Amino acid sequence: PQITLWQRPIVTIKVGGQLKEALLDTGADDTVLEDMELPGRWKPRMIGGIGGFVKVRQYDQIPIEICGHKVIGTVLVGPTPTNIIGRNLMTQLGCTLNF
Amino acid sequence: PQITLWQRPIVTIKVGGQLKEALLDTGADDTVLEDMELPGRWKPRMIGGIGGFVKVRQYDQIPIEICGHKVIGTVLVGPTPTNIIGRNLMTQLGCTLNF
Numbered sequence A, B: 001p002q003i004t005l006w007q008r009p010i011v012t013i014k015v016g017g018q019l020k021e022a023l024l025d026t027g028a029d030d031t032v033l034e035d036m037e038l039p040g041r042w043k044p045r046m047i048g049g050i051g052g053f054v055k056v057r058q059y060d061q062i063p064i065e066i067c068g069h070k071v072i073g074t075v076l077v078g079p080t081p082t083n084i085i086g087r088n089l090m091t092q093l094g095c096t097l098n099f
């Protein structure tokens, strides 16, 4: 698809069995999801953004379906107010910024 | 330009007389710059990032030069870790996301 930016670039994802909405975010190094239940070991991590620093849980090699395409990568889980799809997964969709 | 996302999409911009590096950010509704002094008056505004809400200054009708392009819009100034270009300016560039 081609997605313009007159509104938020929001897509449907499926992770941990659940369908969710998420934001395609070229400013995010990594993918950050709102608190949910995910299986497997994780490791604590700190990320920094506009509101300061937040503590997230880092999950490795987590499968995520984005608009029907299965990708896999690191997923951070924590108290973000919005599900965010980072570059680490957008590369795997073959996604580009065009102007 | 077609920009892949294997690395951060950084561009040089010219604003308020000054040359600066900023991040192309589809997850940002609005453009946000670190403390700067801009032409014109501002009003207070609260914006919400990954760590919570923060007070910024909203300047309207700020001209900005981005990748050989001239644009003009609202620029927010406040405690952001990195300068970010939001959708409000990227639409003026004609940016799209493409899978």
Ligand SMILES: COc1ccc(S(=O)(=O)N(CC(C)C)C[C@H](O)[C@H](Cc2ccccc2)NC(=O)c2ccc3c(c2)[C@@H](N)CCO3)cc1
Residues within 6 Å of the ligand: A025, A027, A028, A029, A030, A031, A032, A047, A048, A049, A050, A081, A082, A084, A086, B023, B025, B026, B027, B028, B029, B030, B031, B032, B047, B048, B049, B050, B080, B081, B082, B084, B086
């Ligand atoms: C290592 O992985 C990460 C991933 C994401 C982040 S981040 O979310 O903190 N962020 C990094 C910088 C560029 C600020 C990138 C996103 O662009 C960020 C995501 C977000 C969107 C909505 C709500 C919370 C977070 N976007 C913004 O901070 C942002 C930027 C501008 C903006 C708004 C938000 C609106 N809430 C109000 C007006 O304009 C940091 C580290």
